[PDB]
Structure 1
Amino acid sequence: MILIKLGGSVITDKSEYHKFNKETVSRLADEIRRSGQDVMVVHGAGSFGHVIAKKYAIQDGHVDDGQIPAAARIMCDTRELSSMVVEELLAQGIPAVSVAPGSCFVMEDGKLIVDNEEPIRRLADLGIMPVMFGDVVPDRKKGFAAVSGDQCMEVLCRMFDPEKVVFVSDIDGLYTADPKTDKKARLIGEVTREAMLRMTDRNRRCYLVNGNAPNRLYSLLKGETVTCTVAKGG
């Protein structure tokens, strides 16, 4: 099994609120289907969550009552975005269903707690891929807290033990600095010296590939070599 995260940087326009990149997700879902590999797809929120959370300081928790309608607005936006991603997967013959973390799990000390793993495992047993995503989750100490797609990878990595982990973003890989502001940073090949090291072991290798490059995710899922950042270690 290969755990993939369709990051918000490719599936959405992180600078334009509520903007869905339909042609990108449609191509990425087609590349996943053409690879023929058993996968579990996660995706981020992008502008379907980050734009409103920053305006209302959702990352700070339940500060005042003015954040309650904004938190529900983000929750509705993330669930709406997941429907569009699932629609692209269903059109490519990939049964999947949206699993909102804010509707089934809780958060505490910055971690997503999965007290009941049965329905998620039963969904994967039916061939209907459970699709978690970045969302606002009820917090046990801060009222509510935001979970990212990265932690959803960490939770699903320890639960299903995938053979490979893939992070899909709008960058060819990890650089020494921001490649959009610093145009001198080099592409870092290996990683042994982010959180890609917490989901790798003896054989599991984490990858960071550019979803904006066509057929790059397809070749990476097929075992061929592509431009990316590979992580290894314990």
Structure 2
Amino acid sequence: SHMILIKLGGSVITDKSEYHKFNKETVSRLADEIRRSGQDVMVVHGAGSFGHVIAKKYAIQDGHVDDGQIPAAARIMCDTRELSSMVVEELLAQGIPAVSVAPGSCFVMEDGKLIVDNEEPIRRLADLGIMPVMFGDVVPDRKKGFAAVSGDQCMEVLCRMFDPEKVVFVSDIDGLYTADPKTDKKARLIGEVTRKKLDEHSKMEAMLRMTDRNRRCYLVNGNAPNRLYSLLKGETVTCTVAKG
């Protein structure tokens, strides 16, 4: 019961300012860091520039309103699946058996909720040692035609099915700050996140939901070499932790 659920956010695996650009060097290092830690893990990744660009250009997250969005949805779904291959290639190269599980090809959505009615394939892939890799995708919706699922929602489902000991968000920031550290030089790192969120980004809300059953959720900078490796081994690193 010591599995660690990891999200390779789109901020580190892709260049979000450059459409369809894969950060092969960062993902290759992150996969090597994952293997050397010797931990049992499951990998979710974001869509990044392989989806967010065409998404809001056609407002895909708002549902099916025009037939012109159908080729756009297919192109987005083709890109997220292609990105997942590049991620899986790096996992396989390190000796981590993994397979892409596209949510848009397997599940449906209803009122912003990812619905996983059939859990057997994901569970059977896990028991075989072939890590099921979910990711942000365009998903059929029961009310809006289609919708968008995030990497965080995919993790919430896997957090429910497999009860990880730790949950780790890998992004391009040292942690949660008072504001965007890229735009506000007067940003200060927040070390702990509890239900003290009552004072107020909304990432505290996203981190806290996965702290069910006294497990700790971490948010760490993947652009810092070996930080993720040390985190997985239990060594103290710079990060934001959600607890309680």
Normalising to structure 1: TM-score of the pair? 0.98
Which residue of 2 is the match for residue 25 of structure 1? Answer: 27
Distance 1:140 1:180 in 2: 38
| Partner Cα distance (2:185, 2:83) in 1 | 32
Equivalent of 2:78, from 76, 79, 97? 76
Q: Which residue of 2 is the match for residue 97 of structure 1?
A: 99
Structure 1 residue 229: deviation in Å? 0.1
Displacement, 1:54? 1.2
Query: Per-residue displacement from partner, 1:31-55 (whole Å, max 9, x unpaired)?
Result: 0000000000000000000000011
User: Deviation of residue 202 (structure 1)?
Assistant: 4.9
For the residues of structure 2 that align with 1:103 and 1:202, how far apart are their CA atoms? Answer: 30
What secondary structure sits across from 1:195 in the alignment? helix
| SS, match of residue 49 in structure 2 | helix
Which residue of the partner structure matches residue 85 of structure 1? 87
> How far apart are 1:185 and its partner, in Å?
1.1
Q: 1:113 to 1:201 in 2, by over 3 A?
A: closer
1:200 and 2:202 matched: no
How far is 1:67 from its partner? 0.5
Identical amino acids, percent of aligned pairs? 100
Deviation track 1:141-187 (CA, whole Å, cap 9, x = no partner) reads 00000000000110100010001000000000000111111110100
Structure 2 unmatched ranges of 5 or more: 196-204
Stretches of 4+ aligned residues off by more than 6 angstroms = none
Work out which of the residue numbers 176, 179, 182 in structure 2 matches 1:180.
182
SS of residue matched to 2:214: coil
- C-alpha distance in 1 between matches for 2:206 and 2:150: 12
1:1-234 pair list within 5 angstroms: 1-193=3-195, 194-232=205-243, 234=244
Give the superposition deviation at 1:195.
Answer: 1.2
Q: How many pairs does the alignment contain?
A: 233
Using the TM superposition, give the Cα deviation of residue 59 of structure 1 relative to its aligned residue in structure 2, in angstroms: 1.3
Q: Aligned partners of 1:201 and 1:15: how far apart in 2?
A: 34
RMSD of aligned alpha carbons:
0.7
SS of the residue corresponding to residue 112 of structure 1 reads strand
Shift of 1:201: 3.4
Give 1:203 shift. Answer: 3.2
> 3-state DSSP class of the match of 2:207?
coil
Unpaired runs of 5+ residues, structure 1, are none
Q: Deviations over 1:71-121 (max 9, x none)?
A: 000000000000000000000000000000000000000010000000100
Secondary structure of 1:40's counterpart equals strand
Q: Tell me the distance in 1 between the aligned counterparts of 2:5 and 2:31.
A: 14
* TM-score, length-scaled by structure 2: 0.94
Distance in 2 (alpha carbons) for counterparts of 1:202 and 1:127: 25
* 1:60 CA displacement: 1.1
Distance 1:201 1:145 in 2: 26
The Cα offsets for residues 2-61 of structure 1, whole Å up to 9 and x where unpaired, read as: 000000000000010000000000000000000000000000000000000011111111
Secondary structure (helix, strand or coil) at the match of 1:196 reads helix
Where 2:143 maps in the other structure, the secondary structure is: coil
Aligned equivalents of 1:53, 1:43: Cα separation in 2: 17
